[PDB]
């Protein structure tokens, strides 16, 4: 059974990733990473050589959903109970008086000492970027503590409520301001602000406020969630409908002297690097480049499609704008000849094969911006958008991605001339999720049969030494792996209990800071993502 495999996997996590540092009185907390061969837990190395075991709860919210779903499908409540216990322990010990948790991009807990840590000295701050924590679980454990987190998050990350100047960073220990009662005055697109309104953090603000509305009927939270979503729609290009990654531009407070110094207070970084050749349209929010387009057309889209459906009638504008943007991205950026997206500016400018003429935020001089393959995360976006709006343009992208990914032909339309590859070797959990979405909307048996094949591939090739890994050579397994999440969604579908498993929004966590090299030097801006890419015998490079 796929269910038996996931049960064994979570048992393995609760064994090997657990607190082994406090004798017979362990905390319930878990290590983010485990070498599945030895059980060595993934460590962060601080400037004096001290090693902490990385326990970052924001990087365990897929695992929390896996544990809740496993308990729902198996009937064994022990996994749900442990997930609750971990949540409770964080509210009890790792929630500041302002409501913020010691988690996120720049804070975590050392499993050995159980103290909060700050791996980025200049950034001892709260940061969520495309995190999408499992607030449904948190509310069921402690609704007051969860609401305090969500309000404290907005309180710290909204720099100016009058104009909705937002920030990807928030300070700890701030007193509560006027919050949802703040007066608001809509500003024109790309107004200049100090705060950086990146949509990865914007995604987490919108999502959290929407969940506070869902659980506590907080109309202020909903008003500002929709208003913040609006902020990313208003500056979209009037002709193409493309964009945007942010709705403000950096306030220029100093004249730059070097292209390679890309600090935001020298002004919009895209205008510096592309302005001379491309004109005023070159703004950071308009740069439809790899990575940014995942935040916009994957993470933002999945969350807003589900939120739009949840809101019923007052969610119709959100659904329309979310689908409209996916149509714009398909119409301008997707190349059906080879399943690539073109790097672009939101005014419709193609940047395919453009050589950067100067250093800057988007690469060194001589960097070539290339079309990039459309991954299976976009197969999910276009599948779910098609279910809401059966536009052949959306189907075209889904069909192109699936074909490029070795899945065969999902058809000229749902159920029409379907020729899927039942011998596919694909083991991507994103493809499994997407096929389940195609199946749910169309009820075409071949889509779930293919999903079962991908599930079997995941177990055959990625279930290694009791953990899930993207390659058998990887040094560390991530306890937040989404392979078991996809397997549980498949089991839930086959058992006619899709609501047993939380909706997949493609959230994840990361930890970023200085990491000490063996020669004692500081490797700045090291991410745990990089540690999870290492194979056996590999080390981080300077």
Ligand X SMILES: O=C(O)[C@H]1O[C@H](O[C@@H]2[C@H](O)[C@@H](O)[C@@H](O[C@@H]3[C@H](O)[C@@H](O)[C@@H](O[C@@H]4[C@H](O)[C@@H](O)[C@@H](O)O[C@@H]4C(=O)O)O[C@@H]3C(=O)O)O[C@@H]2C(=O)O)[C@H](O)[C@@H](O)[C@H]1O
What is the contact surface with ligand X in residues (CB under 6 A)?
122-123, 129, 168, 196, 198, 200, 262-264, 291
Cβ proximity of 405 and 433 under 8 Å: no
From the CB of 262, what's the least distance to ligand X, in Å? 6
- Output 278 or 372, the one with its CB closest to ligand X: 372
Q: Give the N- to C-terminal CA distance of the chain in Å, as an integer.
A: 44
Contact 34, 477 (CB under 8 A): yes
Q: Smallest distance, Å, CB 133 to ligand X?
A: 17
* DSSP conformation class of 264: G
Map residue 180 onto helix, strand or coil: helix
- Nearest-approach distance from CB 269 to ligand X, in angstroms: 7
Rounded Cα distance between 41 and 280, Å, is 49
Helices 483-494 and 445-462: angle between axes, nearest 10 degrees: 140
Nearer of residues 140 and 529 to ligand X, judged by Cβ: 529
**Alpha carbons within 13 A on the beta-carbon side of 430:** 20
Which CB atom, from 46 or from 198, has the smaller least distance to ligand X? Answer: 198
Indicate the residue among 223 and 367 with the shorter CB distance to ligand X. 367
Q: How far is the CB of 288 from ligand X (least distance, A)?
A: 13
**Distance in Å, CB of 49 to ligand X, minimum:** 24
Closer residue to ligand X, CB minimum distance, 114 or 196: 196
Strand partners, 344: 288, 350
Question: What is the closest distance, in whole angstroms, from the C-beta atom of residue 115 to ligand X in the complex?
Answer: 23
In whole angstroms, the minimum distance from the beta carbon of 374 to ligand X comes to: 16
Q: Which is nearer to ligand X, 137 or 287 (CB)?
A: 287
User: In terms of CB distance, is 93 or 262 closer to ligand X?
Assistant: 262
Q: State the Cα–Cα distance between residues 216 and 240, nearest whole angstrom.
A: 38
Instruction: Note the helical H segments in 100-218.
Output: 135-141, 143-157, 199-216
In 3D, which of 390, 389, 388, 426 has the Cα closest to residue 407? 426
Taking each helix axis from N to C end, the angle separating 61-74 and 2-16, rounded to the nearest 10 degrees, works out to 130
Distance between CA atoms of residues 335 and 411, nearest Å: 18
Q: How far is the CB of 295 from ligand X (least distance, A)?
A: 7
Q: How far is the CB of 160 from ligand X (least distance, A)?
A: 16
Q: What is the DSSP string of 346-384?
A: TTS-B-TTEEPSS-BTTB-TT-EE--EE--HHHHHHHHH
| Closer residue to ligand X, CB minimum distance, 198 or 329 | 198
We find the least distance from the C-beta atom of residue 129 to ligand X, in angstroms, to be 6
Residue (102 or 362) nearer to ligand X, CB: 362
Determine contact, residues 14/7, Cβ cutoff 8 Å. no
Please identify, using beta-carbon distances, which residue of 253 and 495 lies nearer to ligand X: 253
In whole angstroms, give the CA distance from residue 329 to residue 323.
10
In order, the DSSP letters of 271-305 are HHHHHHHH-TT--GGGEE-TTHHHIIIIIHHHHHH
- Torsion angle, alpha carbons of 530, 356, 266, 155, to 10: -40
């Amino acid at each position: 059974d796929r269910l038996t495999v996931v049960k064994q996997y979570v048992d393995n996590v609760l064994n090997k990733a657990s607190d082994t540092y406090h004798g017979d009185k362990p905390s319930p907390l878990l290590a983010d990473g485990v070498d599945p061969r030895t059980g060595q837990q993934l460590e962060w190395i601080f400037p004096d050589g001290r090693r902490a075991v990385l326990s970052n709860f924001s990087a365990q919210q897929n695992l929390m959903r896996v544990m809740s779903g496993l308990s729902q499908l198996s009937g064994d409540p022990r996994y749900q109970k442990r997930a609750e216990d971990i949540v409770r322990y964080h509210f009890q010990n790792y929630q500041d008086p302002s409501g913020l948790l010691y988690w996120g991009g720049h804070r975590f807990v050392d499993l050995k000492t159980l103290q909060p840590e700050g791996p980025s000295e200049k950034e001892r701050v709260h940061e969520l970027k495309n995190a999408y924590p499992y607030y449904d679980l948190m509310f069921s454990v402690d609704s007051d503590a969860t609401a305090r987190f969500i309000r404290g998050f907005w309180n710290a990350h909204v720099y100016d409520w009058r104009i909705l100047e937002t920030s990807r960073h928030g300070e700890y220990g701030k007193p509560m301001g006027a919050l949802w009662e703040s007066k608001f005055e809509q500003q024109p697109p790309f107004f200049a602000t100090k705060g950086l309104s990146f949509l990865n953090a914007g995604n987490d603000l919108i999502y959290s406020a929407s969940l506070l509305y869902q659980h506590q009927q907080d109309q202020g939270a909903l008003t500002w969630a929709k208003r913040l979503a609006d902020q990313y729609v208003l500056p979209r290009d009037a002709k193409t409908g493309l964009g945007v990654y942010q709705f403000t531009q950096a306030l220029k407070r100093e004249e730059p002297t070097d292209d390679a110094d890309t600090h935001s207070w020298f002004g919009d970084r895209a205008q510096r690097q592309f302005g001379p050749e491309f004109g005023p349209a070159a703004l950071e929010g308009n740069m439809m480049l790899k990575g940014r387009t995942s935040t916009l057309y994957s993470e933002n889209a999945l969350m807003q499609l589900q939120l739009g459906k949840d809101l019923g009638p007052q969610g119709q504008d959100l659904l329309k704008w979310t689908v409209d943007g996916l149509k714009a991205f398909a119409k301008y950026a997707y190349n059906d000849q080879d399943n690539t997206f073109r790097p672009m500016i939101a005014n419709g400018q193609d940047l395919s094969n453009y050589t950067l003429p100067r250093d800057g935020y988007y690469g060194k001089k001589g960097t070539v911006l290339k079309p990039y393959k459309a991954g299976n995360e976009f197969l999910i976006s276009y599948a779910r958008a098609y279910a809401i709006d059966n536009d052949p343009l959306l189907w075209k992208v889904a069909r192109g991605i699936a074909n490029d990914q070795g899945l065969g032909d999902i058809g000229t339309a749902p159920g029409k001339e379907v020729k899927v590859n039942m011998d596919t070797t694909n083991s991507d959990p994103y493809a499994l999720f997407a096929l389940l979405d195609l199946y749910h909307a169309s009820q075409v048996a071949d889509y779930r049969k293919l999903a079962e094949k991908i599930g079997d591939n995941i177990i055959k090739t990625r279930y290694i030494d009791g953990f899930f890994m993207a390659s058998p050579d990887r040094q560390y397994a991530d306890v937040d792996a989404i392979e078991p999440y996809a397997l549980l969604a498949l089991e839930a579908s086959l058992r006619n209990k899709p609501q047993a498993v939380a909706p997949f929004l493609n959230g994840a966590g990361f930890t970023e800071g200085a990491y000490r090299m063996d020669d004692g030097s500081a490797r700045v801006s090291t991410r745990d993502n990089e540690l999870f890419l290492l194979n056996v015998g590999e080390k981080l490079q300077p």
